[PDB]
């Protein structure tokens, strides 16, 4: 299967940038009756793709001017002479000219904002779990820029891999940060055998980790 | 204008078939080309086969030997099915007009969101998350209510019937086991909590249950 390979995986922009997205194909993209058919959409959240660019460098209708494709063979761009906040949204290239046809993995085009560490929250499972003999303890790392961030579990400072469910949400349409939460989920045997609970967050605005604890006895 | 609808299920069970119709208007099977295509989170956009004006398929050969495309001209319908559905089947799938000679009518349906699994509709165990008896004081405290073991999506939490939604952060559900889990954190300022009260409301349409949970000190 032809490769279509998308740089870079996300592109941070401010509105009035310029902004150029790139796909290299694993072959060249040969015409078919007459037509080189590599198109680029754009897909918003929760939305469809939409088509912006059909055959290389044809904008299609309703399409804006600052919207344009280039290239051959097999490497192709994609450039926006002027970000709007309509263009935020991942970008992808696809290749109809040989079966199976194919897309590009996807750019991110995101909104760049002033630096925010996450503001970081633990808490310890609630009463009415324990009875049921669970025990998840909860971390919110919330509205934190740039995306970059790694959160570590330690029991009696002692690392924790198992059990943890990360779930995080898409850059927020009004502030422009990010989101995440961090589930410790253990049972609760296991939970009363330590004391010690920390969610520890590594990110870009500082070296030293953000840690969050309590114990168990209070 | 030119519009393609989709229909078909939400809820797939494994080893069984999915069926989806594709509904044209604004222009003539006779005409164009339809194609299938779905997007999940690991493995992003895949295209999956075409049907042809002309009536003749083309199919992913990943796919082939489970995959069925068919038109219906007169009532412009186009239909897929895909036998023997697996967890890893779990997408949205999506019929489009592309590969594109044209100016016009290029667009793609609204996508149908398709799950595998045999799980039962089971109502979530809903707890409230307040902060750890010895935490440290901010000028604003975060709470939390945590949402876990139902089954299907979604469920739908607000605070305070709705009246709190600015500092809201709601975390999309993740499959713990084969049922699902979120959580949900709001932010108030310290001064209001515990003096005004806090409940998160979790509504589960599947299994008819709402559940009220007020955030109280530990
Ligand atoms: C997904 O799961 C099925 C059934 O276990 C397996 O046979 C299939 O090849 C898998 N597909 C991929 C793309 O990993």
């Known amino acids: 299967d032809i490769l279509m390979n998308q740089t870079p995986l996300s592109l941070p922009v401010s509105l009035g940038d310029q902004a150029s997205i790139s796909c290299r194909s694993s072959?060249?993209?040969?015409?078919?009756?007459?037509?080189?058919?590599l198109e680029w959409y754009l897909q918003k959240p929760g939305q469809s793709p939409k088509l912006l660019i059909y055959?290389?460098?044809n904008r299609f209708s309703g399409v804006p001017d600052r919207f344009s494709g280039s290239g051959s063979g097999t490497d192709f761009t994609l450039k926006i002479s002027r970000v709007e906040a309509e263009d935020l949204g991942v970008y992808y290239c696809?290749?109809?000219?040989?079966?199976?046809?194919?897309f590009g993995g996807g750019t991110k085009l995101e909104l760049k904002r002033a630096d925010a560490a996450p503001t970081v929250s633990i808490f310890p499972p609630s009463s009415e779990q324990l009875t049921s003999g669970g025990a998840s303890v909860v971390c919110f790392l919330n509205n934190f820029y740039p995306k970059d961030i790694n959160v570590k579990w330690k029991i009696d400072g002692s690392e924790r891999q198992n059990g943890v469910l990360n779930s995080w949400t898409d850059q927020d349409s009004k502030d422009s940060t990010y989101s995440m939460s961090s589930t410790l989920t253990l049972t609760k045997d296991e939970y009363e055998r330590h004391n010690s609970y920390t969610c520890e967050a590594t990110h870009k605005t500082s070296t030293s980790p953000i840690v969050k604890s309590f114990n168990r006895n209070e | 204008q030119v519009q393609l609808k989709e229909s078909g299920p939400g809820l797939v069970q494994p080893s069984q078939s999915l069926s989806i119709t594709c509904t044209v208007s604004?222009?003539?099977?006779?005409?164009?080309?339809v194609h299938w295509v779905r997007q999940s989170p690991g493995k992003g956009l895949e295209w999956l086969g075409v049907?042809?004006?002309?009536?003749?398929?083309d199919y992913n050969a990943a796919f082939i030997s489970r995959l069925s495309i068919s038109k219906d001209n007169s009532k412009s319908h186009v239909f897929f099915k895909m036998n023997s559905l697996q967890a890893n089947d779990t997408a949205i799938y999506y019929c489009?007009?592309?590969?594109?000679?044209?100016?016009?009518?290029?667009?793609w349906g609204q996508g149908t969101l398709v799950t595998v699994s045999a799980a039962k509709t089971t109502p979530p165990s809903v707890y409230p998350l307040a902060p750890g008896s010895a935490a440290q004081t901010n000028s604003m405290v975060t709470l939390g209510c945590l949402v876990k073991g139902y089954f299907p999506e979604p469920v739908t939490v607000t605070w305070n019937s709705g009246s709190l939604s600015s500092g809201v952060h709601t975390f999309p559900a993740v499959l713990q086991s084969d049922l699902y889990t979120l959580s949900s954190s709001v932010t108030v300022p310290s001064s209001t909590w515990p003096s005004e009260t806090v409940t998160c409301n979790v509504a589960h349409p599947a299994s008819s249950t709402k559940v009220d949970k007020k955030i109280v000190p530990r």
């Open positions: 604004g222009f003539s099977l006779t005409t164009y080309g």
């Open positions: 055959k290389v460098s």
């Open positions: 489009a007009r592309m590969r594109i000679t044209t100016d016009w009518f290029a667009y």
């Open positions: 049907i042809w004006s002309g009536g003749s398929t």
């Open positions: 696809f290749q109809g000219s040989h079966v199976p046809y194919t």
């Open positions: 072959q060249y993209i040969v015409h078919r009756n007459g037509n080189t058919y």
